[PDB]
Amino acid sequence: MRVRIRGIYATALTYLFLKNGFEIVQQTPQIAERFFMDIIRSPADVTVKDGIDKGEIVSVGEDIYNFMRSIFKYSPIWRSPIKLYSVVSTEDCKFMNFIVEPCLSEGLVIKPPVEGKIILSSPRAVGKFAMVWKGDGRTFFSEHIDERDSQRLLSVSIPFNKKGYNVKWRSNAAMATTAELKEELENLTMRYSYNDFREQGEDFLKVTLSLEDKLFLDDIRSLVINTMKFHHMLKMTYSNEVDIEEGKVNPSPEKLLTSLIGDNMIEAIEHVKPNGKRVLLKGGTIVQKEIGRDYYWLKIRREFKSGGIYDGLNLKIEDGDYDLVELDSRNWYQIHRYHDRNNNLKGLYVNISTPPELLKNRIRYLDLEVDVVKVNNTVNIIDLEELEANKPILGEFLYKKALEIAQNIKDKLNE
Ligand SMILES: [Mg+2]
Ligand SMILES: [Mg+2]
Protein backbone atom coordinates (compact mmCIF):
# COMPACT_ATOMS: atom_id res chain seq x y z
CA MET A 1 0.00 0.00 0.00
CA ARG A 2 1.08 3.55 -0.69
CA VAL A 3 1.21 5.72 2.44
CA ARG A 4 1.47 9.48 2.92
CA ILE A 5 2.74 10.72 6.33
CA ARG A 6 2.65 14.23 7.89
CA GLY A 7 3.18 15.71 11.33
CA ILE A 8 5.58 15.57 14.25
CA TYR A 9 5.82 11.76 14.11
CA ALA A 10 6.56 11.65 10.37
CA THR A 11 10.21 10.54 10.42
CA ALA A 12 9.67 7.76 12.97
CA LEU A 13 6.48 6.69 11.21
CA THR A 14 8.19 6.66 7.81
CA TYR A 15 10.85 4.28 9.15
CA LEU A 16 8.26 1.93 10.67
CA PHE A 17 5.99 1.86 7.61
CA LEU A 18 8.95 1.19 5.32
CA LYS A 19 10.24 -1.53 7.65
CA ASN A 20 6.80 -3.16 7.24
CA GLY A 21 6.65 -3.17 3.45
CA PHE A 22 4.60 -0.05 2.64
CA GLU A 23 5.45 2.24 -0.26
CA ILE A 24 6.12 5.81 0.94
CA VAL A 25 4.80 8.50 -1.39
CA GLN A 26 4.48 12.29 -1.48
CA GLN A 27 7.54 12.73 0.71
CA THR A 28 8.70 16.21 1.54
CA PRO A 29 12.25 16.91 0.30
CA GLN A 30 13.48 16.71 3.88
CA ILE A 31 11.98 13.26 4.41
CA ALA A 32 13.36 12.09 1.06
CA GLU A 33 16.83 13.24 2.07
CA ARG A 34 16.71 11.56 5.50
CA PHE A 35 15.80 8.18 4.01
CA PHE A 36 17.94 8.49 0.83
CA MET A 37 14.86 7.91 -1.29
CA ASP A 38 13.20 9.45 -4.31
CA ILE A 39 10.09 11.60 -3.91
CA ILE A 40 7.27 9.47 -5.34
CA ARG A 41 4.53 11.72 -6.81
CA SER A 42 1.82 9.06 -6.66
CA PRO A 43 -1.59 9.04 -4.92
CA ALA A 44 -1.59 7.57 -1.43
CA ASP A 45 -3.86 4.74 -0.40
CA VAL A 46 -3.74 5.87 3.22
CA THR A 47 -2.78 9.13 4.89
CA VAL A 48 -1.26 9.29 8.39
CA LYS A 49 -1.00 12.60 10.24
CA ASP A 50 -1.31 14.31 13.62
CA GLY A 51 -4.74 14.54 15.14
CA ILE A 52 -6.34 17.75 16.39
CA ASP A 53 -4.25 17.16 19.49
CA LYS A 54 -0.62 16.50 18.69
CA GLY A 55 -0.65 13.59 21.09
CA GLU A 56 -2.78 11.67 18.57
CA ILE A 57 -2.03 10.05 15.22
CA VAL A 58 -4.90 9.64 12.78
CA SER A 59 -5.13 7.50 9.67
CA VAL A 60 -7.57 8.01 6.77
CA GLY A 61 -8.03 5.80 3.71
CA GLU A 62 -7.52 2.06 3.49
CA ASP A 63 -7.79 0.19 6.77
CA ILE A 64 -4.40 -0.18 8.43
CA TYR A 65 -5.75 -1.01 11.90
CA ASN A 66 -4.05 -4.39 12.26
CA PHE A 67 -0.77 -2.84 11.26
CA MET A 68 -1.10 0.07 13.69
CA ARG A 69 -2.10 -2.22 16.54
CA SER A 70 1.19 -4.13 16.13
CA ILE A 71 3.39 -1.03 16.02
CA PHE A 72 1.71 0.71 18.96
CA LYS A 73 1.32 -1.90 21.69
CA TYR A 74 0.95 0.60 24.54
CA SER A 75 -1.55 3.04 23.09
CA PRO A 76 -5.33 3.01 22.77
CA ILE A 77 -6.44 2.71 19.16
CA TRP A 78 -9.96 3.48 18.05
CA ARG A 79 -11.22 2.18 14.70
CA SER A 80 -14.27 4.08 13.45
CA PRO A 81 -17.35 1.86 12.80
CA ILE A 82 -18.53 4.66 10.47
CA LYS A 83 -16.46 5.35 7.38
CA LEU A 84 -15.37 8.93 6.90
CA TYR A 85 -17.15 10.55 3.92
CA SER A 86 -19.88 7.94 3.86
CA VAL A 87 -23.39 9.34 3.46
CA VAL A 88 -25.89 8.41 6.16
CA SER A 89 -29.61 8.74 6.82
CA THR A 90 -30.66 10.21 10.14
CA GLU A 91 -33.72 10.00 12.37
CA ASP A 92 -34.36 12.13 15.46
CA CYS A 93 -30.87 13.57 14.99
CA LYS A 94 -29.31 10.11 15.50
CA PHE A 95 -27.49 7.63 13.30
CA MET A 96 -27.33 4.16 14.74
CA ASN A 97 -26.06 4.70 18.27
CA PHE A 98 -24.59 8.15 17.63
CA ILE A 99 -25.63 11.78 17.83
CA VAL A 100 -25.21 13.78 14.63
CA GLU A 101 -24.63 17.51 14.18
CA PRO A 102 -26.01 19.27 12.33
CA CYS A 103 -29.34 17.32 12.29
CA LEU A 104 -29.35 16.68 8.53
CA SER A 105 -31.72 13.88 7.52
CA GLU A 106 -29.08 12.94 4.93
CA GLY A 107 -25.49 13.92 5.45
CA LEU A 108 -21.85 13.35 4.61
CA VAL A 109 -19.85 12.12 7.61
CA ILE A 110 -17.02 14.62 7.90
CA LYS A 111 -15.89 13.76 11.44
CA PRO A 112 -16.11 10.21 12.83
CA PRO A 113 -17.79 9.49 16.21
CA VAL A 114 -14.69 9.55 18.41
CA GLU A 115 -16.96 10.35 21.39
CA GLY A 116 -20.37 9.28 20.13
CA LYS A 117 -20.89 12.42 18.01
CA ILE A 118 -20.79 12.48 14.20
CA ILE A 119 -20.29 15.74 12.32
CA LEU A 120 -22.26 15.94 9.07
CA SER A 121 -22.35 18.25 6.08
CA SER A 122 -24.64 18.11 3.07
CA PRO A 123 -24.12 14.99 0.91
CA ARG A 124 -21.30 14.92 -1.62
CA ALA A 125 -20.07 12.27 -4.04
CA VAL A 126 -16.54 11.50 -2.83
CA GLY A 127 -13.65 9.81 -4.60
CA LYS A 128 -9.95 9.64 -3.86
CA PHE A 129 -9.31 12.87 -5.78
CA ALA A 130 -12.42 15.05 -5.44
CA MET A 131 -15.81 15.70 -3.90
CA VAL A 132 -18.68 17.03 -5.99
CA TRP A 133 -22.12 18.36 -5.21
CA LYS A 134 -24.73 20.81 -6.51
CA GLY A 135 -24.11 24.53 -6.07
CA ASP A 136 -23.08 27.81 -7.69
CA GLY A 137 -20.34 25.99 -9.58
CA ARG A 138 -17.12 26.77 -7.71
CA THR A 139 -13.83 24.89 -7.39
CA PHE A 140 -12.29 24.50 -3.91
CA PHE A 141 -8.79 23.27 -3.05
CA SER A 142 -7.33 21.34 -0.14
CA GLU A 143 -4.76 23.41 1.77
CA HIS A 144 -2.11 20.84 0.87
CA ILE A 145 -2.15 21.46 -2.89
CA ASP A 146 0.83 23.49 -4.09
CA GLU A 147 0.02 26.40 -6.40
CA ARG A 148 2.03 24.74 -9.18
CA ASP A 149 -0.60 21.96 -9.20
CA SER A 150 -3.78 24.04 -8.80
CA GLN A 151 -4.14 25.27 -12.41
CA ARG A 152 -4.19 21.77 -13.87
CA LEU A 153 -6.96 20.86 -11.45
CA LEU A 154 -8.94 23.99 -12.25
CA SER A 155 -8.79 23.23 -15.97
CA VAL A 156 -10.43 19.89 -15.21
CA SER A 157 -13.15 21.12 -12.86
CA ILE A 158 -14.11 24.32 -14.76
CA PRO A 159 -16.37 22.42 -17.26
CA PHE A 160 -18.26 20.85 -14.36
CA ASN A 161 -18.60 24.18 -12.55
CA LYS A 162 -20.35 25.43 -15.70
CA LYS A 163 -22.86 22.58 -15.22
CA GLY A 164 -23.58 23.67 -11.65
CA TYR A 165 -21.29 21.22 -9.83
CA ASN A 166 -19.10 22.36 -6.99
CA VAL A 167 -15.77 20.52 -7.04
CA LYS A 168 -13.54 20.13 -4.00
CA TRP A 169 -10.10 18.90 -5.08
CA ARG A 170 -8.41 16.61 -2.54
CA SER A 171 -4.65 16.74 -2.12
CA ASN A 172 -4.17 13.33 -3.75
CA ALA A 173 -5.56 14.87 -6.97
CA ALA A 174 -2.25 16.68 -7.50
CA MET A 175 -0.49 13.33 -8.09
CA ALA A 176 -3.11 11.85 -10.46
CA THR A 177 -2.86 11.77 -14.23
CA THR A 178 -5.07 14.28 -16.04
CA ALA A 179 -7.09 11.44 -17.56
CA GLU A 180 -7.67 9.94 -14.09
CA LEU A 181 -8.96 13.31 -12.88
CA LYS A 182 -11.38 13.65 -15.81
CA GLU A 183 -12.67 10.12 -15.32
CA GLU A 184 -13.03 10.92 -11.59
CA LEU A 185 -15.26 13.95 -12.11
CA GLU A 186 -17.31 12.10 -14.73
CA ASN A 187 -17.93 9.22 -12.31
CA LEU A 188 -18.53 11.45 -9.29
CA THR A 189 -21.00 13.79 -10.98
CA MET A 190 -22.90 10.76 -12.34
CA ARG A 191 -23.08 9.05 -8.90
CA TYR A 192 -24.20 12.33 -7.30
CA SER A 193 -26.95 12.73 -9.86
CA TYR A 194 -28.20 9.22 -8.99
CA ASN A 195 -27.83 9.91 -5.25
CA ASP A 196 -25.42 6.94 -5.19
CA PHE A 197 -22.91 7.08 -2.35
CA ARG A 198 -22.45 3.36 -1.69
CA GLU A 199 -18.96 2.23 -0.66
CA GLN A 200 -17.63 5.79 -0.94
CA GLY A 201 -16.49 6.04 2.69
CA GLU A 202 -12.90 5.84 3.92
CA ASP A 203 -11.56 4.00 6.95
CA PHE A 204 -10.52 6.04 9.96
CA LEU A 205 -8.53 5.29 13.07
CA LYS A 206 -6.98 7.30 15.85
CA VAL A 207 -4.01 6.33 17.98
CA THR A 208 -3.92 8.08 21.34
CA LEU A 209 -0.20 7.76 21.98
CA SER A 210 1.13 7.01 25.43
CA LEU A 211 4.51 8.26 26.59
CA GLU A 212 5.72 4.66 26.31
CA ASP A 213 5.02 4.65 22.58
CA LYS A 214 6.33 8.23 22.23
CA LEU A 215 9.63 7.07 23.75
CA PHE A 216 9.59 4.12 21.36
CA LEU A 217 9.17 6.66 18.56
CA ASP A 218 12.04 8.76 19.98
CA ASP A 219 14.17 5.59 19.69
CA ILE A 220 13.04 4.90 16.12
CA ARG A 221 13.62 8.49 15.01
CA SER A 222 17.07 8.23 16.61
CA LEU A 223 18.06 5.66 13.91
CA VAL A 224 17.57 8.32 11.20
CA ILE A 225 18.51 11.72 12.68
CA ASN A 226 19.67 13.15 16.03
CA THR A 227 16.86 12.69 18.58
CA MET A 228 16.68 13.56 22.29
CA LYS A 229 14.77 11.57 24.84
CA PHE A 230 11.26 13.07 25.17
CA HIS A 231 11.53 14.53 21.63
CA HIS A 232 7.97 13.72 20.57
CA MET A 233 6.47 14.65 23.95
CA LEU A 234 8.26 18.01 23.82
CA LYS A 235 6.99 18.56 20.25
CA MET A 236 3.51 19.00 21.72
CA THR A 237 4.68 22.32 23.20
CA TYR A 238 7.84 23.31 21.34
CA SER A 239 8.89 23.35 17.71
CA ASN A 240 12.35 24.50 16.61
CA GLU A 241 13.62 24.65 20.21
CA VAL A 242 13.75 20.85 20.24
CA ASP A 243 15.75 20.65 17.00
CA ILE A 244 18.22 23.27 18.22
CA GLU A 245 18.96 21.31 21.40
CA GLU A 246 19.37 18.18 19.31
CA GLY A 247 22.18 19.83 17.37
CA LYS A 248 24.29 20.30 20.54
CA VAL A 249 27.10 17.88 21.55
CA ASN A 250 25.21 15.88 24.19
CA PRO A 251 21.55 16.94 23.76
CA SER A 252 19.50 16.93 26.96
CA PRO A 253 15.73 17.57 27.37
CA GLU A 254 16.33 18.93 30.94
CA LYS A 255 15.93 22.66 30.30
CA LEU A 256 12.84 22.39 28.08
CA LEU A 257 11.30 19.89 30.52
CA THR A 258 11.97 22.33 33.42
CA SER A 259 10.43 25.24 31.43
CA LEU A 260 7.08 23.40 31.13
CA ILE A 261 6.64 23.46 34.93
CA GLY A 262 8.73 26.64 35.21
CA ASP A 263 6.86 28.41 38.03
CA ASN A 264 6.21 25.22 40.12
CA MET A 265 2.46 25.30 39.30
CA ILE A 266 0.15 22.74 37.66
CA GLU A 267 -3.12 24.33 36.47
CA ALA A 268 -4.63 20.87 35.65
CA ILE A 269 -3.97 17.14 35.38
CA GLU A 270 -5.19 15.86 32.02
CA HIS A 271 -6.76 12.46 32.82
CA VAL A 272 -7.05 10.90 29.34
CA LYS A 273 -9.67 8.18 29.17
CA PRO A 274 -9.05 5.13 26.94
CA ASN A 275 -11.39 6.66 24.27
CA GLY A 276 -9.22 9.87 24.03
CA LYS A 277 -11.43 12.23 26.05
CA ARG A 278 -9.19 14.55 28.09
CA VAL A 279 -10.76 15.11 31.53
CA LEU A 280 -9.27 18.06 33.45
CA LEU A 281 -8.55 17.27 37.12
CA LYS A 282 -7.59 19.74 39.82
CA GLY A 283 -3.94 20.79 39.78
CA GLY A 284 -1.81 22.36 42.51
CA THR A 285 1.62 23.50 43.62
CA ILE A 286 4.79 21.55 42.84
CA VAL A 287 6.28 21.19 46.34
CA GLN A 288 9.26 19.14 45.11
CA LYS A 289 10.65 18.04 41.76
CA GLU A 290 13.65 16.42 40.07
CA ILE A 291 14.25 16.94 36.32
CA GLY A 292 17.16 15.01 34.81
CA ARG A 293 18.47 13.99 31.41
CA ASP A 294 16.12 11.02 31.10
CA TYR A 295 13.38 11.30 33.77
CA TYR A 296 11.34 13.71 35.86
CA TRP A 297 9.55 13.28 39.20
CA LEU A 298 7.17 15.69 40.96
CA LYS A 299 5.20 15.93 44.18
CA ILE A 300 2.09 18.11 43.76
CA ARG A 301 0.00 19.46 46.63
CA ARG A 302 -3.66 19.87 45.66
CA GLU A 303 -6.01 21.94 47.84
CA PHE A 304 -9.64 20.83 48.26
CA LYS A 305 -12.77 22.72 49.30
CA SER A 306 -15.90 21.13 50.79
CA GLY A 307 -17.86 19.22 48.23
CA GLY A 308 -18.53 15.66 47.39
CA ILE A 309 -16.80 12.37 47.95
CA TYR A 310 -13.22 11.30 47.23
CA ASP A 311 -13.45 8.64 44.44
CA GLY A 312 -12.44 5.14 45.60
CA LEU A 313 -11.92 6.20 49.25
CA ASN A 314 -15.71 6.98 49.50
CA LEU A 315 -14.81 9.76 51.95
CA LYS A 316 -16.47 13.18 52.19
CA ILE A 317 -14.31 16.11 51.01
CA GLU A 318 -13.88 18.74 53.74
CA ASP A 319 -12.51 22.31 53.78
CA GLY A 320 -8.72 22.33 54.02
CA ASP A 321 -8.35 18.76 52.74
CA TYR A 322 -5.28 18.28 50.59
CA ASP A 323 -3.69 15.68 48.35
CA LEU A 324 0.03 14.90 48.05
CA VAL A 325 0.47 13.38 44.58
CA GLU A 326 3.70 11.71 43.57
CA LEU A 327 4.29 11.17 39.89
CA ASP A 328 7.28 9.92 37.93
CA SER A 329 8.02 9.55 34.19
CA ARG A 330 9.37 5.97 34.88
CA ASN A 331 6.23 4.98 36.84
CA TRP A 332 2.91 3.62 35.51
CA TYR A 333 1.15 4.96 38.68
CA GLN A 334 0.53 8.07 40.81
CA ILE A 335 0.29 7.78 44.62
CA HIS A 336 -2.30 10.19 46.06
CA ARG A 337 -2.07 10.72 49.83
CA TYR A 338 -5.28 12.40 50.98
CA HIS A 339 -5.06 14.48 54.16
CA ASP A 340 -7.32 16.69 56.29
CA ARG A 341 -6.37 20.26 57.32
CA ASN A 342 -4.56 18.94 60.45
CA ASN A 343 -2.39 16.57 58.25
CA ASN A 344 -4.37 13.44 59.35
CA LEU A 345 -4.10 10.71 56.63
CA LYS A 346 -7.59 9.99 55.25
CA GLY A 347 -6.47 7.44 52.66
CA LEU A 348 -4.26 6.44 49.73
CA TYR A 349 -5.37 6.23 46.09
CA VAL A 350 -2.98 4.74 43.58
CA ASN A 351 -3.98 5.87 40.11
CA ILE A 352 -2.77 3.38 37.44
CA SER A 353 -1.84 4.89 34.09
CA THR A 354 0.62 5.21 31.26
CA PRO A 355 3.74 7.21 32.26
CA PRO A 356 2.90 10.91 32.91
CA GLU A 357 3.71 13.48 30.20
CA LEU A 358 4.62 17.14 30.79
CA LEU A 359 2.69 19.97 29.07
CA LYS A 360 2.94 23.71 29.80
CA ASN A 361 1.77 23.88 33.45
CA ARG A 362 -0.02 20.54 33.04
CA ILE A 363 0.40 16.80 33.51
CA ARG A 364 -1.13 14.32 31.05
CA TYR A 365 -1.55 10.57 31.32
CA LEU A 366 -3.62 7.82 29.75
CA ASP A 367 -5.72 6.46 32.60
CA LEU A 368 -5.93 2.67 32.74
CA GLU A 369 -9.23 2.45 34.73
CA VAL A 370 -8.08 0.06 37.45
CA ASP A 371 -6.91 1.78 40.65
CA VAL A 372 -5.70 0.56 44.05
CA VAL A 373 -7.13 2.09 47.23
CA LYS A 374 -5.79 1.84 50.79
CA VAL A 375 -7.82 3.06 53.77
CA ASN A 376 -6.48 1.96 57.18
CA ASN A 377 -5.30 -1.57 56.37
CA THR A 378 -7.94 -2.30 53.72
CA VAL A 379 -6.16 -2.62 50.34
CA ASN A 380 -8.51 -3.01 47.37
CA ILE A 381 -7.92 -3.18 43.63
CA ILE A 382 -10.98 -1.40 42.21
CA ASP A 383 -12.60 -0.88 38.78
CA LEU A 384 -11.20 -4.06 37.21
CA GLU A 385 -14.52 -4.32 35.38
CA GLU A 386 -13.95 -0.88 33.80
CA LEU A 387 -10.53 -1.95 32.54
CA GLU A 388 -12.33 -4.97 31.06
CA ALA A 389 -14.90 -2.70 29.34
CA ASN A 390 -12.03 -0.79 27.71
CA LYS A 391 -9.98 -3.77 26.50
CA PRO A 392 -11.10 -3.50 22.81
CA ILE A 393 -9.55 -0.02 22.43
CA LEU A 394 -6.70 -0.49 24.95
CA GLY A 395 -5.55 -3.72 23.30
CA GLU A 396 -4.23 -6.78 25.05
CA PHE A 397 -0.78 -5.43 25.94
CA LEU A 398 -1.98 -2.37 27.87
CA TYR A 399 -4.69 -4.54 29.40
CA LYS A 400 -2.15 -7.09 30.62
CA LYS A 401 0.26 -4.40 31.79
CA ALA A 402 -2.45 -2.68 33.85
CA LEU A 403 -3.25 -6.02 35.52
CA GLU A 404 0.46 -6.55 36.37
CA ILE A 405 0.83 -3.05 37.82
CA ALA A 406 -2.38 -3.41 39.86
CA GLN A 407 -1.16 -6.68 41.40
CA ASN A 408 2.28 -5.15 42.05
CA ILE A 409 0.78 -2.13 43.80
CA LYS A 410 -1.53 -4.29 45.95
CA ASP A 411 1.46 -6.41 47.02
CA LYS A 412 3.50 -3.30 47.86
CA LEU A 413 0.63 -1.68 49.79
CA ASN A 414 0.18 -4.94 51.72
CA GLU A 415 3.79 -5.27 52.94
MG1 LIG B 1 -7.46 5.72 37.48
MG1 LIG C 1 -12.78 5.54 38.54
Numbering used by the authors: 1 to 415
Quote the study that presented this structure, word for word.
Finally, in vivo experiments in Haloferax volcanii suggest that this RNase participates in the maturation of pre-16S rRNA.
The structure of the SaRNase W protein was solved to 2.0 Å by molecular replacement using the PfRNase W protein as a model. Two magnesium ions, two phosphate ions and two bound dinucleotides from the co-purified RNA are visible in the PfRNase W structure and only two magnesium ions in the SaRNase W structure. Although the overall structures of both RNase W proteins are similar with 27.5% sequence identity, they can be superimposed with a 5.6 Å root mean square deviation (rmsd) over all 400 C-alpha atom pairs. In the PfRNase W structure with a 5′-phosphate dinucleotide bound in the 5′-sensor domain, the central domain with R10 completes the recognition of the 5′-phosphate through a double hydrogen bond interaction. In the SaRNase W structure, the position of a bound 5′-phosphate (modeled in Figure 6B) would be 4.5 Å away from R10 (R4 in SaRNase W).
